[PDB]
Ligand SMILES: *[C@@H]1O[C@H](CO)[C@@H](O)[C@H](O)[C@H]1NC(C)=O
Ligand SMILES: *[C@@H]1O[C@H](CO)[C@@H](O)[C@H](O)[C@H]1NC(C)=O
Ligand SMILES: *[C@@H]1O[C@H](CO)[C@@H](O)[C@H](O)[C@H]1NC(C)=O
Ligand SMILES: *[C@@H]1O[C@H](CO)[C@@H](O)[C@H](O)[C@H]1NC(C)=O
C-alpha cells in the first residue's frame with residue numbers, strides 16, 4: 159500500500175499528468191522510473207540538469223518541457239564555477255553597478271470575531 | 275515596476291495570508307452540516323421528532339461536535355498569529371536598520387553592499403526596495419604584504435599594495451585606483467627580516483624634493 | 486481513515502459523519518512537510534555558484550584538512566563531518582503512519598558546504614557580496630585583524646605563532662566532540678521527541694476510550710447494530726482526537742524548528758560570509774572568521790575568535 163499523487167502543470171497550459179506511487183515498487187503497482195520516493199509513471203527520466211520545478215524527493219524534480227511532455231531529472235544545485243586561489247596575487251574591481259532588489263513581508267492578518 | 279508586473283508570484287506571501295484565513299472560515303461553516311452521530315444536523319428536527327429524554331442526547335452530540343470545531347479554529351488562528359507576529363517583528367527591525375540607517379549586516383538589507391532602502395505600502399504587509407553596490411570587472415594584480423625600504427618594513431594605512439606588472443602602487447580594496455607609495459600613505463613597523471613575502475621598492479618622501 | 490478504521494467498512498462509512506477533520510489533518514501535516522525543505526533551503530543554498538575545493542589544504546601555515554572533504558572516504562566528508570554523522574519503521578508504517586524523503590540528499594548538502602568553504606578560504610567574503618575575488622590567505626587574515634582593532638603588522642610578525650595556535654585549536658575540536666557524547670544532544674533531542682510522538686500515536690490504538698473492545702471487528706461480531714454503534718463511536722472519537730493532538734504538537738514543534746533554521750541562516754550570512762561586530766553572536770571573543778560543517782538534521786559552525794591574554798598595568802592620562 160501507499161499514497162498516490164498526481165504531478166501536473168497548470169491546466170491553463172496542459173492537461174498532461176504523471177502519477178507517483180509513494181513508497182511503492184514499480185512491479186507492485188500493476189515511462190516507468192524508480193526513485194527513492196516511490197515509482198513514477200508517465201514522466202520521462204533524462205540525464206540533463208535543470209532548476210527544480212515540481213519537487214518529488216531525493217534530489218528528483220519534474221517539469222513540463224518541450225513535442226511537449228513531462229520529464230524527470232536530478233535537480234541542479236547551482237552554476238558550476240571555480241575560484242582562483244593563488245598566494246601572490248589579488249583581484250581588484252575596476253568598475254561597479256547599482257542594483258535594486260525587492261523584499262516582501264506580511265505584517266498583519268484579517269481580524270475576525272465569532273458568536274459562539 | 276516591470277518585475278512585479280511580469281512575476282505575479284512575487285506577492286504570493288501576502289496572498290497566502292488572505293487565502294489561509296479565507297479557508298479557515300469556510301471550513302468552519304461547512305462543519306455545521308455534520309451530524310456527529312445525531313439523527314439530523316438540524317436542531318429543530320431533533321426536537322420536533324423526538325421526545326425530551328432522547329432529543330437532548332442527540333442535541334448533546336451536535337453541541338459537542340460544534341464546540342470542538344470552534345476550538346480547532348481558534349487554536350489554528352493562535353498558531354498563525356504567532357507566525358505573523360514574527361514577520362512583523364522582522365519588518366519593524368528592517369525598517370529601523372535598513373531605512374532609518376545603513377546596515378553592515380551581510381545580506382540583511384539585500385545582496386551586495388547596502389547603501390539605502392525605501393519602504394512601500396502593500397495589502398496586509400510592507401515592501402522594501404533595497405539599493406546596493408555591486409563590484410564589477412575585476413583584474414589580476416601582483417601583491418605583497420609589505421614594502422622594504424631603508425631596512426624598514428612599510429605597511430599600507432588603508433589599502434593594498436599592487437603591481438600592475440613592474441611598478442608598485444597602493445590602492446583601495448573595493449575599487450582600483452593606483453597611487454604612488456609615499457610616507458603619508460604607509461606606516462613603519464619592524465625590519466625587513468620578519469615579513470614573509472616582503473619586496474624591495476623605494477618609498478617616496480614628499481619633503482626631500484623641496485629641501 | 487486507515488489509522489482510525491483500518492479495513493472495517495462499517496467504521497469507514499460512519500467516519501464520514503464527523504465532518505472534514507481528516508482533510509484538515511492532512512492540510513496541517515502537508516504544510517509542515519513542505520516547510521521542512523524550505524528551512525534547509527534557506528540555510529545552505531545561499532550561493533548560486535558552486536565552487537570546487539582547492540588542490541591544497543595548507544595555506545601559509547594554516548591547516549584546513551579537518552574541515553575540507555577527505556577524498557579517502559567513500560562519502561567524501563571531512564574528518565569533523567564524519568564524526569558528527571557517526572554520533573547522530575514497519576511497526577508505524579503498518580498503522581498508516583509513513584515518512585517522506587527530503588528533497589536535498591546528504592550529498593547535495595555536502596556540495597553546498599564545500600562551495601562555502603572553498604569561497605571562504607580562497608576569496609574571503611567577496612564571494613558573498615559579489616564576484617569571488619582571490620586573495621592570499623595571510624592577507625585575508627590581516628584584514629580580519631584590522632576589523633577587530635588590531636594593527637595588521639601584529640599578524641605578519643607573528644604568522645608562525647598564529648598559524649600554530651589555529652592548527653592546534655582545530656585539532657582539539659574533533660577530540661572534544663569525540664569524547665563528549667552529549668555534544669550533539671541538541672540534534673539528538675529533536676529526533677527523540679518526534680520518535681516518541683509517533684510511538685504514542687500508535688499505542689493509543691490499543692485504548693478503548695470507554696468502549697467494550699479496542700478492536701472494531703471484535704464489536705460488530707458480538708453486538709447488535711445499535712449497541713455496536715455506541716462502542717464504535719467511542720473508538721472513532723478517541724482515535725480522531727488522538728490524531729488532532731498529534732498534529733497540534735507537530736505544528737508547535739515546527740514553529741520552534743523554523744526559528745532555529747532562521748537563526749542558522751542568519752549566522753551563515755553574518756559569520757561565514759562576512760565578519761561580525763555583534764558581541765557573542767559568532768562565538769565569545771573578537772570574531773575573525775567561521776567555517777560551516779554538515780550534520781544530521783542541522784548545521785554546525787566552527788567559530789574562530791581572537792582572545793586577549795597576559796595584561797599588564799600601566800599609568801595613563803587623557804591628554805598630554
Ligand atoms: C492563461 O494563459 C494565457 C495565455 O494563453 C494568459 O494570458 C493568462 O493570464 C493565463 N491565466 C492564468 C490563470 O495563468
Ligand atoms: C523494487 O523491486 C526490484 C525487483 O525485485 C528490487 O531489485 C528493488 O530493490 C525494489 N526496490 C524497492 C524499494 O523495493
Ligand atoms: C544516463 O547515463 C547512464 C550511463 O552513465 C545510462 O546508463 C542511463 O541509461 C542514462 N539515462 C538516461 C535517461 O539517459
Ligand atoms: C563602467 O561600466 C559602465 C557601464 O555601466 C561604462 O559606461 C563605463 O565606461 C565603465 N567604466 C570603466 C572604467 O570600465
Ligand SMILES: *[C@@H]1O[C@H](CO)[C@@H](O)[C@H](O)[C@H]1NC(C)=O
Nearest residue numbers: 241242243249411412413414
Ligand atoms: C584572473 O586569474 C584567474 C586565475 O588564473 C583567471 O581565471 C581569471 O580569468 C583572471 N582574470 C583576469 C581579468 O585576468
Ligand SMILES: *[C@@H]1O[C@H](CO)[C@@H](O)[C@H](O)[C@H]1NC(C)=O
Nearest residue numbers: 437438439440441442443452
Ligand atoms: C604600469 O604603470 C606605469 C606607470 O608609470 C606605466 O608606465 C606602465 O606602462 C603600466 N604598465 C601597464 C602594463 O599598463
Ligand SMILES: *[C@@H]1O[C@H](CO)[C@@H](O)[C@H](O)[C@H]1NC(C)=O
Nearest residue numbers: 244245246470471472545621
Ligand atoms: C607561493 O607559492 C609558491 C608555490 O606555488 C611558492 O614557491 C612560493 O614560495 C609561495 N610564496 C610565499 C610568499 O610563500
Ligand SMILES: *[C@@H]1O[C@H](CO)[C@@H](O)[C@H](O)[C@H]1NC(C)=O
Nearest residue numbers: 422425466471472473474475
Ligand atoms: C632587498 O635588498 C636586500 C639587500 O639590502 C637583498 O638582500 C634582498 O634579497 C632584496 N629583496 C628583494 C625582494 O629583492
Ligand SMILES: *[C@@H]1O[C@H](CO)[C@@H](O)[C@H](O)[C@H]1NC(C)=O
Nearest residue numbers: 542543547548549550551656
Ligand atoms: C595537516 O594536518 C594533518 C593532520 O590532521 C597532517 O596529517 C598533515 O600532514 C598536515 N598538513 C601539512 C602540510 O603538514
Ligand SMILES: *[C@@H]1O[C@H](CO)[C@@H](O)[C@H](O)[C@H]1NC(C)=O
Nearest residue numbers: 793794795796797798799800
Ligand atoms: C593590576 O592592578 C590591580 C589592582 O589595581 C591588580 O588587582 C591586578 O592583578 C594587576 N594586574 C597586573 C597584570 O599586574
